[model samples]
Structure formats: structure tokens, C-alpha cells
Target: DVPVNLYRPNAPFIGKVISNEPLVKEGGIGIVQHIKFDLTGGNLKYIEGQSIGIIPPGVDKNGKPEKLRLYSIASTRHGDDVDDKTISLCVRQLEYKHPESGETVYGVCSTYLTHIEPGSEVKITGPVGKEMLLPDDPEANVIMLATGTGIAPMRTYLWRMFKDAERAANPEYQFKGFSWLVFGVPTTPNILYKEELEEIQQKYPDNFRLTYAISREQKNPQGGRMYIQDRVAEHADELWQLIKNQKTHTYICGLRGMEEGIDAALSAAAAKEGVTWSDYQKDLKKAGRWHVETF
Candidate 1:
């Protein structure tokens, strides 16, 4: 048997930020920017719901190595009009006040990304992370749950689906069934592509639904603000109804803690429908109705 190393580069790799723009700002964290690297050289091929693993540069603070963080590629293979040879990434920056310096420290990648003008080179690799991608079926209803930047990959999936349905090469392959995206953020301005997303929702109103859960900027809430779990619960009856009526699919992306809450809510919804929660989850997973991608 031949010996092989796991961390091996299979092909060529390119480094660069394709686009950059300010998205949002909170405290010292300006949630400003969407960056997509050209992965045309990585032999990368991906579908909706798939993600890439980027090898961010390492830094030594005094004397310790920082772990690399992964961001889902938001650009789809179908929609990436570049020779069917490019891949993209969606990223954000984190900041904190340094104890010794008495100064604020910008997150490594985010700081780099924020300052990098277009055409700047940055290391990236792999169309990894299988959890993000779901099966393609014209009849399946897909529900997506995301918080903040997590919406990136879900957008990729939705865009690809629509593109595939109408592209010249696949003009006859029509995509039907409903797609729902439940997103949560702090304020209205921070909402990404609101007009564009709304247009798509209007264009395919029967098959696409987009809901925003602004924790801080709703129009005079009666109580606390709304969140994804809250919205999911508020529509539990409808969500369950979808599962009962057709092959419903669900995908969740973002912080890891949200998974348990969502899983519980889903279980509760399943219980209300007079089905065993475990079996209900199993059935949905088997039918491609339940999916998740968290980091």
C-alpha cells in the first residue's frame, strides 16, 4: 500500500479577494464585507448548500498559534459566471480590546479582509464541508434557518437552484415546491439584499418565502424581539403542515448553540402533530426535509 498524507494539496490554488463592501457595524465590529476568493485552480466543484474550507494565515500573539476559522462559500457554481471555474467565500470580522495594549484588536481575517482592496491575494482552499449541501429534488420544500452571516451559504443554494431551473443548458428542467428562509439580525440596514430577496420572493411568491427576524428593530413589539426559533415556533403549525403535505426540507446555519433550540422546537412541532419526535426527524432527514450547517 502507498502512504498518503491527509493534508495534501491536490491541485493549483489561487489567492485573492473578488469583492468587498461594508455590510453592517456593531460596537467595534463593523460587520462590513462580503469576500469571495477565486478557487478556479483548486479543482473545486460544488452545488447549492456546499461550502469551502479556507486556510487562513496563522498569527502568533506573543507566542501562541490561532486556530483557523471556516466560512461557507456564498457563490454558487451555477451562478459564478466565470468559466465555471471560480468559487467564493462569505466572511466577517471580530474585534476585542486587548488587555495589555489598552487598545482594540481587529480580528485577523476580518481586519485583513476589511483593508484588502479588490485583487489582493489571500490563501483559500477546498470545497469542503458536506453538511451544507442538500439533495436536489424538484418536489422537495426547503426551509432555511440562519443568523447573521450564516445566510451566505443558504443564498448560494437558492440562487443555484433558480439558475439551474432557467439556465439555457437546462431550460426544460423546472424547479417547483416552496423554499423558505428565516433570517435573524440586529437592525434593518444590516439586512442583506433585502430588495433583491424581496423581488425574488415576489417573483416566485408561491414557491419562495423570506422572513426577517430583527431582534432589535421590529415595529413596536408587544414583548421581547423575534428570533428564528420564535418565528419557527410561531409558524410551527404551518411548518408541520408542510411536512405533512409534501416532502419538506429544513436547513440551519450559523452559531452552534442554535441547533439545540431549533431541534427542540422541531421536536415539539412534531409532537404536536402526534408523531414520535425521533421518527419524525428521521423521516424528514431521509426525505431531505431536515438539514443543517453550523459553525
Candidate 2:
């Protein structure tokens, strides 16, 4: 069963920031951090792909209470500590040039979160979203596509599917499944959870595979900067075959705009077989085999 809207904004759980560490290494573009919170004395439980609302302190420009911003939770339901006492988020400080003014602007929630100090209490609410939850079948294949901080939920799924400690914790769940992750980033350092993810791939060579689309450094066949869609097109054939199986689940999590390109790539591949990718995708969604969580 899926857990929906377990908490509301009117009354939020006051969680303590246990640690806020940078997820990006030197030379990585922009600022991203992994923030873990103490869920002590609270029962705010959630699954992967779910999000939590953070009510930033202080008043807005109109003098109303600051509105809450939803961030995808990076930890598994067992929590990052694997002790069920904590939760975490992978956040990137949003910085961009204002279209009109050309002035750099910061995201209110992300700025507040990135600069938040450890041990400080922050208001939190809602273990929301059930659309991106993992399949119950432990031996099912999972195809993951992610970019930037959208890796949060994918991280949770990986831990549950491959992490030794995570697997140990879930004695009833034995993941003998094959999984593949195609991550897109600007540079090598921008790959979040780089070490942990690679470590798993190294250990489970057959069970897991990793691919990266470094947009700025890699090139598409047309010689343009390689993006996620380009990478999808490159391997769309094999992915289509894998996804045809009833035991396979496909996930896409990133910019909402990404859907268009991905569909175009997959559609072309499907058309070769006289199949319509859109109609097949609709059926897959009905079967709960395809999932998406984009912003």
C-alpha cells in the first residue's frame, strides 16, 4: 500500500539537522549538499521517491509565513543511518541568471537549506508521493534515468536493491534483480553519491550497470553536447528490449522537459517494430511498470 500525505503544513515535525555535507567535489558546477535530519521522537515515515516539505523560517515579502518547499527525500524508508532514526535530502542551491535582469538569483528554500547549520531545528511536513515507489518483487529489473539532484529517489532504490547493509536490514527482501542507472551530469564531480554508487557497480558487475552522460564533455552522434536524451537514443534499442519483459520497471526522474526528448527517442525505436511507444507507455503505467517524478 502507498502512504499519502502523512503530514500537513499546519503542523509540521520539527526535525534537527544532523549534518549537511557537500555532495559535489572540487570542479563540480554549482553547489549541492547531502543533508540528514534527526527524526527523533517523530513517526514521519516515508518511502523512496516521496518528498518532505520544509517551512523556511521568517516571513515572506507580503509578511505571511514563509511557504514550504518540497524536496525529494534521499534516504530509504530504513533511513540513511540504517537505524530508522533519521532522514535525508540531496539539495542543490539553485542559482541562475534572471531572464530579464540577467542578475543571479538564488532559490529561497535551497539557499536556506544549503546554509542551514547542523543541530538546528527546522520545520518539516508531509511524507508525500507514491508514484515513484519501487516494485515489491525483489527479482525485478529496474531501469533508472536521472539528472542533477533528481538522483535522490534513485539513490534510495539503489540502496534497497544493492547495498549490503540495506539488504541485511531487509531480511524478507532479497534483491537478485538486475538494475541499470543512466545518470547525466555536467562533469564527473557532479555525479552525486559517486563513490557509493560506483562501489556497488564494482561489486555487483552483473547485477548492476552504470552509465553517465556528461553533457559538457561528452558528444552526441550529431556532435552536440551529449544529454540524457542522446544517451537514451544511443541505447534505446537494448533498453526497449529489457523493458518489454513483465518483470522490468522503468523510471525517469528529472526535469519535466526531459520527457519530450525521451519520448521522441523511444518512439523512434518503437516505430521500427510497428509499435507506438506512447500507447505502450500508457499500458505500462496502468501495469505500474513505468514511473516518473520530475520538476
Candidate 3:
């Protein structure tokens, strides 16, 4: 069964940061990190597609306690080290220029996380999320779509599927399945876990396929920057055929805006077959094959 809210904000588990490494290249645009926390003595446990909470240690403008923020777990259930002693998160420091003051502002929790020192203890909560859980079916066809840090959950699934250590640890799950991943980033260097993803692709050539939509470096049919939707449009026909399979499971994660783009692209593809995209999607959801988690 999928785990839900293993730890709550009221009683968060205290975990120390073991390491926090930069995911972006030196010439990349923003600050993003692959941070791992020590969970050796804790009861917190999670799986792919689940999220955990970080209670930023400070108060807000109202002089109250800072709230907890949920972040999708980036490591597989076995953890990055394959020992279940730690957990990881992929986070981008949310920064922006204030419209009125013209001063830069940063996101609270993200700032705390991306800058937190190794061996630093922090409050953590929840291994939460049920809808995004990966299916146990060994031969299922999995489709993962997301951009930037939203690659979190997808990372876990890939690790579980192709990582040699992960496969050896989980005797019950030997993923003999096909996986298709479509990831979007502004530049090649901005792609998180670049080498790791490619390594899996190199090893599992027949079982895995990877696609990228490098917006700043590529163009779409309309001569605009290549976005996730444009990539979906290019592969909609192939994706549709895959979706038509009974064993296929499609996962779309990221901001809510991505939903519309993907839906409309698939719309035309489905229409060609005398079907309605929305209606077909409804059936997928009812069958627990179409999964989404967007903000």
C-alpha cells in the first residue's frame, strides 16, 4: 500500500543534512541542489512519487513560526546510497525581483534548504502522496513527463527501475518494463542528474527512452521556444499508441499550466482516432493509470 503522512508537522523528524550538491552547471541560470538528509535513526520512510515536508526554522513577518513546505523526494525508496539511511530532494531556490521595491526576494524554505550546511539538523515531515505512486506491475509501460526540479519523483522511479544497486536490493521488484521520459530544461547544463540519467539510458537502451525539450536551445513548429507541450505534440502519435496499451501508465507532474498544454496536444492525436482526449483521460483516471500532481 502507498504510505501517507508518515510524519506530521506537529511532530517532525529531526534529520541532518548529509550533503547538498549543486545540480546546475557553473554557467546555468539558477541555483538548484540535490540535497540529502540523514535518516539513519528515524522512522521516516518513503517511496517513489511521494513528497516530504521541511519545516523552515524561523518565523514570518507576523512573528509566527515559519510553515512547512512539501518537496517531492528525489531518491528511491532504497535511498541514494541503497541503504535506506538517507533521503534526497531536488530543489531550486525560488528567486525573483520584487515588482515594487526592485529588490531580489527568495523563497523561504528553498533558501534554507539549498544553503543548509552538511551535518545540520532540520525538521522534516510526511512521506506523503498517494496519487503519484508507481505501479507494482513488473512489465508495465511507464511514461514520465516533467520539467526542471519537477523531475524529483521521476528520478526515484528511474533509480528503482535501472540502478544496479536498487535492482539488487529489491528482490521482489525486477522491473522488466519499458520507460519513456520527457524532460524539459532551459539548457543542457540545467538538466539535473544528467550523467546518471544517461548512464541508465546507456545500460537499458531497449527498455528506456529519453527525450528533452531544451527551450532556449531549440524551436518548435511555430518557430517559438520548444516547450513541454511542443515536445508532446511531436510525440503525441507515438505516445497515444502507447497509452492505448492496457499496461501503460502515464505520469505528468510540474506546475498546473503544463496540464493544459499536454491535454490539448493529445487532443488532436486522439481526435484522429475518433476519440475525445478528456473522456479517454477520465477512463484512465478511473482505472488508476493516469497520475498527476501539480501546483
Candidate 4:
């Protein structure tokens, strides 16, 4: 028989799991976990805004492991240490039991991650992305928009600010102007870490602000169910003023489709402030004031 191409041997990467505690364990689908990977002196040090892309093993397709997916890190670089060194991920269980078919659909990573036990070996890959830039102007203000796990990066950034504030009686390096976050969800239960956000707000009452819109809530500030875009519209004048005149930076992270709703809200607000939507978005992009990330 003629010789064919030689086959290569298979190999697996090794990593130790430090902890497998669920931060927000319950809710219909609200789930977040605190997991630590044993680097063994590898490159894991990342900025407050960087993301890690792990080479997650895929499904057993005819008895073979599948591919990997990317995930953004939700822990600040400064928080890494020997004992408490870890990263946080806000994972949502997207698959639910079928009512009639009684079949189960698997969420590739969500299932793989939710089943991990302490000290287990898991394979992962690079910290592919660079640090997400914050405004360099000391006087610049910031506003964050996210729903569900979308708030991961913002949470990491805000935690660092609060940590620094504690080191000084009055922090020398303080971000001036207000830092606002607007988040939306279908129900209160689906709102992950509601209390944690509140704690950050309490700690930095003067600088940090928050607005939440729940679509399934019985009543809201407007006396009806509201979404994040609605809340953004309600605060149109304030947000436009901050971005246009105060030169604030805005960040949007969450579901892929949210940009449409948010953009519409921003456009209307900008129009009220006597600026065209095109010009408004153009200026924000030019000044590096607006950023969006969705998946």
C-alpha cells in the first residue's frame, strides 16, 4: 500500500482550579462564579479592562472535544494575589428545559463552567485583548451602559476607584464629574448582583451613580414597566449635557441589539440639546468618547 500522511499525537493543556464558588448562585438564570486558574508563573497579569480568551473544550461530536470561546475578565489586576488571586465571570444559563419535547439544549461554556469542581484540571489559552482605555483627562466624567453580565468590566473599573479612595482621606487622584451606570433587565431576579452595585454606590455616593430599568417589574419611576433606554431617555438632558459640554466618556456593553435602542435614545437627547444625531455620534467617536462591545 502507498504511504499516507503521518498523523500527529493528541495533547492536552493542564491547569488547576483554585475555587468553584458561585457568587450569584440562584435565580431562574442569573448565575455568576468566582473561578481562579493556576497560572504556574504564566502571563495572567492584565489591566483592569482587558479580556481573557480561554480555549474551552467543545462538545463530544462523535467522541471528540470541540473548540473554544472568548470571555472578558471581570476582576481588576490589582486584586490578584496568592490566596485570593482569581477572575470573576457572570455567566447566564441560556438553555432551558423544553416544555413539550423534554429535550435539553446545552450552552457550550455555561455547561462546562457550571459543572467544575475545586482542584479540577481545565485547559485555557491567551489574554488576547489589550487594556480598555479610560479617559486620560483628570476632569473627564464617565457613564457606563450594560445589562446582565455586560456590567462586568464596569464593575472591575469601579471597584478599583473605590479601593483607591480608601487609601487616602481625600484621594489625590480622583475622577471629577459624575460616573453614572444604567443597567436593564427583564426582572429583578435576573438583575445580577443588585446589592453589590448598591454597595459601590454607597461607598462613593458623591461620584458614582446608578439607574436600573426592569421590564418585568410591577411599577417603576414612570409608573409602568421600563427599559434601560427609557431611563436613558428620562435622563436625556443630563447625559447629553455631560457628554457634550463636560466631555464625558460613554461605554456600552451587553446584548448585540442594545446599541440600536441606546443610539436612538442618544440621538433624541442630542437633538434636544440642539445637535444632529450624525454630528453627535461623530464627535463622540472622534474624541474616543463612545465605545461599544457586544456578543
**Candidate whose lDDT is highest:** 3
Candidate 4: residue 160 lDDT (0-100):
56
- Model 1 misplaced stretches (Cα beyond 4 Å): 1-12, 25-29, 40-42, 62-67, 96-105, 163-166, 169-173, 219-222, 286-288
Per-model TM-score versus the true fold: 0.83, 0.97, 0.98, 0.80
TM-score of 2: 0.97
Residue pairs in candidate 3 whose N, alpha carbon or C atoms collide under 3 angstroms? none
Residues 36-79, candidate 1: write the lDDT tens digits: 55554445566566655444456667665444456676776653
Provide the clashing-pair count of each candidate structure: 6, 0, 0, 0
**Candidate 1: 10-residue stretch with minimal lDDT:** 1-10
Pairs clashing within candidate 4: none
lDDT of each: 0.66, 0.89, 0.91, 0.64
Candidate ranking (lDDT, best to worst): 3, 2, 1, 4
Candidate 3 has a TM-score of: 0.98
Q: In candidate 1, how many Å is residue 294 off?
A: 1.5
Off by over 4 Å in 4: 1-15, 25-30, 58-65, 80-85, 96-102, 136-138, 164-173, 218-224
Q: What TM value does model 1 have?
A: 0.83
Q: Candidate 3's residue-wise lDDT over 27-138, tens digit each? A: 7889999999999787888889999999998899799999999999999987899998999999999899878355998889999999999989999999988888888988
Query: Of the candidates numbered 1 and 4, which has the greater TM-score value?
Result: 1
Please provide, for model 4 over 1-295, each residue's C-alpha lDDT reduced to its tens digit, 9 standing for 90 to 100: 2111111113323557766656553553445565666655444455555555544565555866665555655665544341234555555545657763558776767767766777877765544453255654646687888877777777766665655532242244455557899988777666666777788788779888988887877454667678777787788778877877546778877768767767787788777757887777877777677776677
Ranking by TM-score: 3, 2, 1, 4
